[PDB]
């Protein structure tokens, strides 16, 4: 009933990057598992070898390790994921994928 089958390969890889990053930054088990499950859905419909997901994870790790601050109380983990999906290297990585 979800739109999983309608995404292009590129979109699946972006959806994967987002969900995966959310799995990295959040602490709560239920949420983390949820984000993981979601990611796995996008990996299922991918045509790429597993290493590309490992590489996406390397890049994601560059964002999930950031310390974000503001004038209100928060770690702003969510926005680390949002900045991450705008990453230029992530986009280049997906665009030059061997398995199209």
């Amino acid at each position: 009933e979800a739109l999983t089958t309608q995404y292009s390969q590129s979109e699946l890889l972006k959806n994967w990057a987002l969900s995966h990053c959310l799995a990295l930054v959040y602490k709560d088990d239920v949420v983390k598992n949820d984000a993981r499950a979601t990611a796995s859905a996008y990996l299922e419909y991918g045509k790429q070898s597993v290493e590309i997901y490992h590489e996406i994870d390397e890049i994601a790790k560059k964002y999930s390790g950031l310390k974000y601050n503001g004038s209100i109380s928060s770690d702003f983990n969510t926005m680390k994921c949002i900045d991450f999906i705008h990453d230029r290297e992530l986009n280049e990585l997906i665009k030059r994928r061997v398995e199209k």
Binding site: E1, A2, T4, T5, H20, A23, R36, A37, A39, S40, A41, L43, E44, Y45, G46, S49, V50, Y53, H54, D57
Partner: protein, 155 residues
């Protein structure tokens, strides 16, 4: 040919556990990818274990995404790949049924593939069938609506 039903059922029981446990059991790159959360659906991995354990191992060069286990044997991690693999190594099924239900598969044992709509992570499932139930989960024959059921009989 094809794995014996009894050996297949035994093998499958060895990995009929949580994906994390499957990771600990198989180890190597399978275990590593499960540890990292990259693999959450154990279905094709379990079936891979079955084939690898019963004398019908998945070839290193089969055109499907594979990951090695601690045994240096190979495990397919996508449901669609696992289904295609069976279609291409076992040949053509003994039984094909549109809108499948339990009664359609009664008295027959082997590898069952059910495709349908209603799942957000896969187009279907592949598991063992003993004549009345599936080996994992289970009463598949409810959000998932089966459109096509396919069986390769195991001797």
């Amino acid at each position: 040919n094809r794995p014996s039903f009894n050996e297949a059922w035994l093998a499958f029981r060895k990995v009929n556990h949580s994906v994390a446990d499957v990771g600990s059991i198989i180890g190597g790159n399978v275990g590593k990818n499960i540890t990292g959360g990259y693999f959450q659906n154990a279905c094709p991995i379990r079936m891979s274990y079955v084939l690898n354990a019963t004398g019908f191992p998945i070839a290193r060069n089969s055109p499907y995404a594979k990951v090695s286990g601690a045994d240096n044997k190979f495990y397919i991690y996508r449901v669609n790949d696992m289904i295609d693999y069976l279609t291409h190594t076992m040949g053509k099924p003994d039984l094909i049924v549109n809108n499948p239900k339990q009664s359609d598969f009664i008295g027959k044992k082997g590898i069952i593939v059910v495709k349908g709509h209603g799942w957000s992570n896969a187009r279907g499932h592949v598991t063992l069938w003993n004549g009345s139930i599936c080996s994992d989960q289970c009463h598949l024959l409810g959000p998932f609506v089966p459109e096509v059921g396919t069986l390769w009989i195991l001797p």
